[PDB]
Amino acid sequence: HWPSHPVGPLMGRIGCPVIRDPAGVGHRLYALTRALKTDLHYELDPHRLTPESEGFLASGVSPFELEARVSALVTIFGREGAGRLLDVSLDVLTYAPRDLDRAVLALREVFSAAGDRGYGRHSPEGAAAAAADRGYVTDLAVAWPGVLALPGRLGGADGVARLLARVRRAGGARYRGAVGRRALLSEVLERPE
RNA sequence: GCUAACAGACGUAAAUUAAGCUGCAAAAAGCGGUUUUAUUUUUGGAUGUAUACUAUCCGACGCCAAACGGCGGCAGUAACUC
Ligand SMILES: [Mg+2]
C-alpha cells in the first residue's frame, strides 16, 4: 500500500502498522502527504515520525479528518508560521482542531504581550498588538511543541506556571524575551504535575 | 424600568488565584494598599424583561365606578270615563 521508502526504516519508528495496516496507514500517509502538498510545499517524508505519532495514524481517524486538521492548523497558525512550526515535531498534527484552538487561545490569553493577563489591545494598533500576540505564541510553539499540551494541567494554570517562573527577578516584558530564548516552562509544567 | 413586581429562606453573603498602578526603610530583597479580570458561590419568576411577567374580573365570536355597588317619594294638570 506504500511503494516508496521501504518499511524497514519505517517499522522502527511506527509500530501502528502492525495492527491496522491495509487501508489505515497507507491511506492516512497518502492523504497527509497530499494534504501538505496542497499546502505551501510541505513534503512530510515519513522518516521524521516519532513513536508518539500514534495519533493521526490510529484506526479510527478518517483521511477527511486529517484534511480538516491540516486546514485548521494552517487556519489557527499562519501557513508561513504553520510551515515553520511543522519543520520540527509533527506531533502537533495529533491534536484535534477544537482542542488545538482551545490551547492556542489560552496561550494567547496567558502569554498576552499586548496588555494584561486579559487579552489586551482588543481589535489600528490594537490589531497590531493582537498580531504580535499571534506571532509570540507561534514562536513559542516553534521553539517548543509541548506548550500545546497546557490543558493537561489546566486552562487557568498557565498563568500559575508563568508566575512560578515569574517570582524570581522582574516583570512580564523581560520574561517574554527570556521564555522565548530558553525553555523555562518545562520545569514549571513538571512541577505542576 | 430589572438586585423588577410577586412568592419563599431569614438575624446581613462572600472563598481562591491573576494583571495593572503602586508604597517603606534601605548595599542587589520582603510585606502590603487600591482598580480591573478569571474560577466558584449568588432560590422561582428567568439564563425572561413592558408585544414581557404577576394579580383581579368578565368568560368565544357577532350587534349597539369594566374599584366595592345601587340608581326615591308627595299629590294633580290632555273637547265621554281613564
Ligand atoms: Mg402597564
Does residue A192 sit in helix, strand or coil?
Answer: coil
In terms of Cβ atoms closer than 10 Å to its own Cβ (0-12, 13-18, 19+), residue A153 is middle
Contact between A2 and A8 under an 8 Å Cβ cutoff? The reply is no
Resolution of the structure, angstroms: 3.0
CA A153 to chain centre: 16
Q: How far apart are CA A17 and CA A54, in angstroms?
A: 10
Contact between A9 and A45 under an 8 Å Cβ cutoff? The reply is no
Q: Which long-range contacts (CB under 8 A, 24 or more apart) does A6-10 make?
A: A9/A47, A10/A46, A10/A47, A10/A49
Helix, strand and coil in chain A, % to nearest 5: 65, 0, 35
Q: How many angstroms separate the alpha carbon of residue A27 from the centre of ligand 1?
A: 68
Q: How far apart are CA A143 and CA A123, in angstroms?
A: 27
Q: Which nucleotide is nearest to A120 (CA to C1')?
A: B19
Cell digits of residue A103? 490551547
Q: How far apart are CA A173 and CA A72, in angstroms?
A: 30
Q: Which residues have a Cβ under 8 Å from the Cβ of A177 and sit 6 or more positions away?
A: none
- Tally helices (H) and strands (E) across chain A: 9, 0
Does residue A123 sit in helix, strand or coil?
Answer: coil
Q: Which of residues 26-45 of A touch strand B (CB under 7 A)?
A: none
Q: How far apart are CA A122 and CA A9, in angstroms?
A: 50
Determination approach? cryo-EM
Q: How far apart are CA A46 and CA A29, in angstroms?
A: 8
